[PDB]
Write an enzyme that holds these catalytic residues in place. Structure first.
Site, PDB file in Angstrom:
ATOM      1  N   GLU A  41      27.491   4.202  50.959  1.00 16.42           N
ATOM      2  CA  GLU A  41      27.189   5.198  49.954  1.00 16.42           C
ATOM      3  C   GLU A  41      28.100   4.888  48.748  1.00 16.42           C
ATOM      4  O   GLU A  41      29.302   4.674  48.938  1.00 16.42           O
ATOM      5  CB  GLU A  41      27.510   6.565  50.522  1.00 16.42           C
ATOM      6  CG  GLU A  41      27.208   7.676  49.548  1.00 16.42           C
ATOM      7  CD  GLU A  41      27.527   9.033  50.101  1.00 16.42           C
ATOM      8  OE1 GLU A  41      28.649   9.232  50.588  1.00 16.42           O
ATOM      9  OE2 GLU A  41      26.659   9.924  50.021  1.00 16.42           O
ATOM     10  N   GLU A  80      26.157  16.302  41.691  1.00 10.72           N
ATOM     11  CA  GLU A  80      26.544  16.775  42.996  1.00 10.72           C
ATOM     12  C   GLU A  80      27.565  17.894  42.806  1.00 10.72           C
ATOM     13  O   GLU A  80      28.311  17.893  41.825  1.00 10.72           O
ATOM     14  CB  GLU A  80      27.173  15.646  43.791  1.00 10.72           C
ATOM     15  CG  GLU A  80      27.746  16.104  45.129  1.00 10.72           C
ATOM     16  CD  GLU A  80      28.094  15.031  46.125  1.00 10.72           C
ATOM     17  OE1 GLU A  80      28.085  13.842  45.782  1.00 10.72           O
ATOM     18  OE2 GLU A  80      28.387  15.367  47.282  1.00 10.72           O
TER      19      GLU A  80
END
Length: 181
Positions: free
Chosen positions: A77, A168
Site C-alpha cells: 500500500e 482519507e
C-alpha cells in the site's frame, strides 16, 4: 482518463464525484471516528505524473490529501502525501530517507501492517509513505521520483493495482474538493 472510483466507507461523510469531469468532494464536517478513503483514479497505476488542484481543510483531523494505490506482489500500500491534518505517518514509522521532487523534500518511511484490510481481503503488507515537507493543495506529482526511491528499499515498482488521488480521514472533521487534470 478516470476509470476507477475509490469508495472505502464513503458513507461516513458526503462523497460526490463526476468521473468525466475528474472532480470529487468529501465533507466530514460532523466528524468521523472510523476510517474512510475516497477518490478518483485508474484501475492500473503507473509512474506517469499526476496534476491536481484541491481545496482541503483538515486541521484537527487525522487526514491525508494523497496519491494512493497498491502493488499486487510484493503487496504494498503506498501514499504520496501532499497535505495532511494532525498526524504524520513517518513520525512513527521506519525512516527510509528523503526524496526531493516537484519543489520540495519528502520524508520517506515504511511500515508493516499485519492481518489488516487489503486488496486481497485481510493480509500482511508493506506501506511506503512520502510526506511532503512544504505541504500544498495543488501541483504535479512526478510519481516516478517516489517509485524509484522506494524501489531501493524493496518496492516492487511493477504489477500495479489501482491508483487514485484520495482523501482519507479517521478522526476529526473537515472537507475536501479535488480536480484531477
Amino acid at each position: 482518463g478516470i476509470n476507477y472510483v475509490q469508495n472505502y466507507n464513503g458513507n461516513l461523510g458526503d462523497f460526490t464525484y463526476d468521473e468525466s469531469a475528474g472532480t470529487f468532494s468529501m465533507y466530514w464536517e460532523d466528524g468521523v471516528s472510523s476510517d474512510f478513503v475516497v477518490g478518483l483514479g485508474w484501475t492500473t497505476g503507473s509512474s506517469n505524473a499526476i496534476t491536481y488542484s484541491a481545496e482541503y481543510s483538515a486541521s484537527g483531523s487525522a487526514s491525508y490529501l494523497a496519491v494512493y494505490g497498491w502493488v499486487n506482489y510484493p503487496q504494498a500500500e503506498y501514499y504520496i502525501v501532499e497535505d495532511y491534518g494532525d498526524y504524520n505517518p513517518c513520525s512513527s514509522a521506519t525512516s527510509l530517507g528523503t526524496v526531493y521532487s516537484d519543489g520540495s523534500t519528502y520524508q520517506v518511511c515504511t511500515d508493516t501492517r499485519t492481518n489488516e484490510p487489503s486488496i486481497t481481503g485481510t493480509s500482511t503488507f508493506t506501506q511506503y509513505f512520502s510526506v511532503r515537507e512544504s505541504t500544498r493543495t495543488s501541483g504535479t506529482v512526478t510519481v516516478a521520483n517516489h517509485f524509484n526511491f522506494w524501489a531501493h528499499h524493496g518496492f516492487g515498482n511493477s504489477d500495479f493495482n489501482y491508483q487514485v488521488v484520495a482523501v482519507e480521514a479517521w478522526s476529526g472533521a473537515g472537507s475536501a474538493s479535488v480536480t484531477i487534470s
